[PDB]
């Protein structure tokens, strides 16, 4: 069963996250302090990065922003690249050209993209061609605790396999498969399909993570597969505290899928749309949720409409604030000032719960939409406070910032 | 006398501590409501340009409001008033021969542009005594209506001294009770005044003066009553922070202090009273000015806050006027300017193809550092916001990270989230490079 942290000596802001060990939104408490550590699996590196990585790295994104820059957590996180695998020596023998080389172009085109939607870079980015040999020393170790025997697995009182997904011998995975190449005792193999996510992230960040995170594709067989993995390299229970999935994108009611050819790189999306207009279509569909994209830009209507609605907000009070004159202006703090503020006050209290409430982003951008309507008409009629007007411009920074969104 | 503490359910605890010159100790800060925290200080009195006294006073509570909202994420509403019609203000208007509210709306402006220079917020209200004066007659009115004040013939309104202590519920001088001998005052044995330690609500104006119409006959407001009829409108019977230079924490605060609690009729109108310290200059009170335009044509923005920062804001300073005491703060500001100008180039000409991003011990290292440094510096704002401790601490890591940049092999990812820190804490701080 799963123990939840104790809340002692920890930041507690009574944040609650879906948390799929659990099955069920629980209280967030970091394991030490106000640490978090996160490991997020990263993509593979044989093709144009889709929709569906950016759904999960700007949903991930915009996390970890309300973590650090809006809960004040301190978060280190660690993004692994896949850059040697089956599907990557696969492609690099229809190509007729060489595999390191392939990987090397799509990671290069991947981090592109990734900034171009302002996604952070990780604290740590871990490439398997450079942790081969740490690997081979990590399936050492489980030995003296190649395949995973899952029987002799379960058989352990400390250890339960499949925490997440209810469903020698078949139900064994591989670790190490060996070379239809890279030297290691037991003989010429490649890793396998799973165990490098579990190897670099314990490097690292040890033996609990406060969070880990991927799309939902990848809670089975790959995580839980890790956290067995983890448990039986450690000799321990709980690998990781929190697991963090995001749900699935469709794109036309079906799932992006390699025989369709259904993809839309995120290199095409950026020539119609802007990266906030990426961004806040994200913010619109809660991370832990399922999303159907309508190509062509149905999907994209309300999303361009939020992004000029913030943008034009923008204009207005930047100008009222350069024409405001101290001298000529009279500061009596009105009845309509006053209600103002109530509702600015409101909206900080009102976007503080919704951030609680499982990242809510959908409803924390509806309560900004809310509150720009009515400093719209504070500016146009009312004799302007410019106190107040700059410290909700402040604000309302402050929450874009939150979002990665950029006016 | 008794202070009580606000309780702590449902109320943002960040664990900090103030110096609290009601308690005259450190004591845990709790809002009042929430996470919010009404807030009034004392504003000047636009008579004359600005000198550096203002500045320190109200750059460090500048530092402290980004403290509070930027790092710990409180929600502060605050107010300062703007003295525009006062004794100072008559003399000089008469002496320069010009209009008493053009002289005022001068050099409101000017401390407003001084205040700019220096990066320092404005507030959310900004409360003129002569916009306010008809809301301060009301204010009067119901000190008089529950008997702590009495009306002279002359016209003036004065603070029944004698009947506020009276009250159980009352205590005169909460904040330096032993700075209340004057003795054969003339309008004590006149019969004018009760008691010589009464003080003026409502003056019954000489000629050629401003004046306004009021019950009492045509006169200006006193002193102390117009920061009292402001902040209680605006913010109500409970503050959780008052703030203001150390000279005016007796007579002015305390009288300010007495007339809200005589109004309301309660015994704690400010939760909290944080007073900053004396600026000296040559080890002299300031008597030898420095305008803080003047400061400004010799010093950046950046290095006159970084001084602030050097010296607790509770704390006396002494101010050296041969440049002694801003050599340091040049120095740093150089250093810091230096290192923005390498990390951003190293970032930028970082090359993810040609690179290799095995985690190392020099990696671990430096991010072992970060994540102290932080830690270090959240401890440092809650005691008191200690920033002169948690500059130190980014200076330090800050040596470390040159160091890494320059002969290890860099993780780009760790050396983005150091500068995002670090220009977050410096955000904090209200320097900008
Ligand atoms: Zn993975
Ligand atoms: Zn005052």
Same mark, same amino acid.
């Given at each position: 069963?799963?123990?939840?942290?104790?809340?002692?000596?920890?930041? +507690?802001?009574?944040?609650?996250?879906?948390?799929?060990?659990?099955?069920?939104?629980?209280?967030?408490? /970091?394991?030490?302090?106000?640490?978090?550590?996160?490991?997020?699996?990263?993509?593979?590196?044989?093709?144009?990065?889709? *929709?569906?990585?950016?759904?999960?790295?700007?949903?991930?994104?915009?996390?970890?922003?309300?973590?650090?820059?809006?809960?004040?957590?301190?978060?280190?996180?660690?993004?692994?690249?896949?850059?040697?695998?089956?599907?990557?020596?696969?492609?690099?023998?229809?190509?007729?050209?060489?595999?390191?080389?392939?990987?090397?172009?799509?990671?290069?085109?991947?981090?592109?993209?990734?900034?171009?939607?302002?996604?952070?870079?990780?604290?740590?980015?871990?490439?398997?061609?450079?942790?081969?040999?740490?690997?081979?020393?990590?399936?050492?170790?489980?030995?003296?605790?190649?395949?995973?025997? +899952?029987?002799?697995?379960?058989?352990?009182? %400390?250890?339960?396999?499949?925490?997440?997904? /209810?469903? %020698?011998?078949?139900?064994?995975?591989?670790?190490?498969?060996?070379?239809?190449?890279?030297?290691?005792?037991?003989?010429?193999?490649?890793?396998?399909?799973?165990?490098?996510?579990? #190897?670099?992230?314990?490097?690292?960040?040890?033996?609990?993570?406060?969070?880990?995170?991927?799309?939902?594709?990848?809670?089975?067989?790959?995580?839980?597969?890790?956290?067995?993995?983890?448990?039986?390299?450690?000799?321990?229970?709980?690998?990781?505290?929190?697991?963090?999935?995001?749900?699935?994108?469709?794109?036309?009611?079906?799932?992006?899928?390699?025989?369709?050819?259904?993809?839309?790189?995120?290199?095409?999306?950026? #020539?119609?749309?802007?990266? @906030?207009?990426?961004?806040?279509?994200?913010?619109? @569909? %809660?991370?832990? @949720?399922?999303?159907?994209?309508?190509?062509?830009?149905?999907?994209?209507?309300?999303?361009?409409?939020?992004?000029?609605?913030?943008?034009?907000?923008?204009?207005?009070?930047?100008?009222?604030? %350069?024409?405001?004159? *101290?001298?000529?202006?009279?500061?009596?703090?009105?009845?309509?000032? @006053?209600?103002?503020?109530?509702?600015?006050?409101?909206?900080?209290?009102?976007?503080?719960?919704?951030?609680?409430?499982?990242?809510?982003?959908?409803?924390?951008?509806?309560?900004?939409?809310?509150?720009?309507?009515?400093?719209?008409?504070?500016?146009?009629?009312?004799?302007?406070?410019?106190?107040?007007?700059?410290?909700?411009?402040?604000?309302?920074?402050?929450?874009?910032? #939150?979002?990665?969104?950029?006016?």
């Amino acid at each position: 069963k799963w123990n939840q942290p104790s809340k002692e000596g920890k930041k +507690i802001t009574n944040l609650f996250v879906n948390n799929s060990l659990t099955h069920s939104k629980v209280e967030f408490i /970091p394991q030490e302090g106000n640490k978090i550590k996160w490991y997020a699996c990263g993509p593979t590196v044989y093709d144009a990065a889709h *929709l569906g990585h950016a759904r999960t790295y700007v949903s991930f994104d915009i996390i970890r922003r309300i973590l650090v820059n809006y809960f004040k957590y301190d978060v280190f996180m660690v993004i692994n690249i896949t850059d040697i695998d089956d599907k990557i020596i696969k492609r690099s023998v229809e190509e007729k050209i060489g595999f390191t080389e392939l990987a090397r172009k799509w990671e290069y085109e991947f981090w592109e993209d990734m900034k171009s939607l302002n996604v952070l870079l990780p604290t740590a980015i871990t490439r398997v061609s450079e942790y081969v040999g740490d690997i081979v020393k990590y399936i050492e170790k489980i030995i003296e605790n190649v395949y995973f025997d +899952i029987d002799e697995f379960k058989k352990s009182e %400390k250890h339960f396999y499949a925490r997440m997904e /209810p469903l %020698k011998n078949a139900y064994d995975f591989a670790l190490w498969k060996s070379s239809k190449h890279w030297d290691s005792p037991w003989g010429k193999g490649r890793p396998g399909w799973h165990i490098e996510c579990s #190897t670099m992230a314990s490097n690292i960040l040890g033996d609990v993570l406060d969070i880990h995170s991927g799309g939902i594709d990848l809670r089975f067989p790959h995580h839980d597969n890790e956290l067995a993995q983890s448990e039986a390299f450690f000799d321990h229970s709980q690998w990781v505290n929190y697991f963090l999935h995001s749900g699935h994108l469709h794109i036309e009611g079906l799932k992006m899928s390699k025989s369709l050819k259904n993809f839309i790189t995120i290199k095409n999306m950026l #020539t119609k749309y802007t990266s @906030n207009q990426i961004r806040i279509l994200f913010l619109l @569909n %809660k991370w832990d @949720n399922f999303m159907n994209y309508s190509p062509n830009g149905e999907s994209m209507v309300q999303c361009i409409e939020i992004d000029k609605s913030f943008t034009n907000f923008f204009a207005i009070i930047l100008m009222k604030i %350069k024409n405001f004159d *101290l001298n000529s202006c009279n500061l009596y703090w009105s009845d309509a000032d @006053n209600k103002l503020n109530l509702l600015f006050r409101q909206t900080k209290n009102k976007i503080h719960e919704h951030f609680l409430d499982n990242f809510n982003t959908p409803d924390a951008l509806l309560a900004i939409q809310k509150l720009i309507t009515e400093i719209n008409i504070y500016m146009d009629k009312e004799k302007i406070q410019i106190g107040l007007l700059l410290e909700i411009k402040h604000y309302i920074n402050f929450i874009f910032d #939150t979002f990665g969104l950029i006016y």
